[PDB]
Amino acid sequence: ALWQFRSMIKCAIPGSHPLMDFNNYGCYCGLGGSGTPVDELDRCCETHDNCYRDAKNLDSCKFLVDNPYTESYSYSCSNTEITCNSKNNACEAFICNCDRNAAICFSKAPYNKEHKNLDTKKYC
Numbered sequence: 001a002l003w004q005f006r007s008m009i010k011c012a013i014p015g016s017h018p019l020m021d022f023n024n025y026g027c028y029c030g031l032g033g034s035g036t037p038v039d040e041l042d043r044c045c046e047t048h049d050n051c052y053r054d055a056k057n058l059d060s061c062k063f064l065v066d067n068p069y070t071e072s073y074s075y076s077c078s079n080t081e082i083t084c085n086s087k088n089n090a091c092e093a094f095i096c097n098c099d100r101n102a103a104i105c106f107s108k109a110p111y112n113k114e115h116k117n118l119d120t121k122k123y124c
């Protein structure tokens with residue numbers, strides 16, 4: 001679920017700021033998404049959206065209000081390392097891994113302040 005995704009992010013990036021949650025980034029981070037990602041970090045968010053879209057396409061998976069962000073799973077954090085519980089069901093596991101991969105992706109990508117709260121109608 002979304003709140004767990006946020007938790008994974010704090011796990012992989014201990015120094016990230018809580019207030020950042022009020023903002024969006026690039027063309028895909030925290031947005032519906034449009035155009036092409038502006039940088040590596042934004043690409044991580046687009047890839048995450050594609051991951052969720054793939055999950056929804058799983059005929060065997062149904063999410064509350066068709067929103068994968070509502071799907072709670074089980075995961076653990078240890079020394080900035082994220083682990084998805086093997087006992088999550090197939091649908092939850094897909095989402096957990098989408099979140100996990102995105103969190104790791106974020107931790108390695110450069111953060112460009114100029115892309116925070118981007119003028120999407122113009123650059124996306």
Ligand SMILES: C[C@H](CCC(=O)O)[C@H]1CC[C@H]2[C@@H]3[C@H](O)C[C@@H]4C[C@H](O)CC[C@]4(C)[C@H]3C[C@H](O)[C@]12C
Pocket residue numbers: 006009013015016017020021022023024025029030031041045106107111
């Ligand atoms: C981890 C990363 C970098 C933080 C830093 O260097 O301080 C930040 C930059 C923009 C952030 C994203 C944006 O704030 C948009 C979304 C806000 C939601 O509350 C969480 C997911 C969400 C998709 C955030 C994931 C993560 O916290 C991002 C990707």
Ligand SMILES: [Ca+2]
Pocket residue numbers: 071072073092
């Ligand atoms: Ca669940």
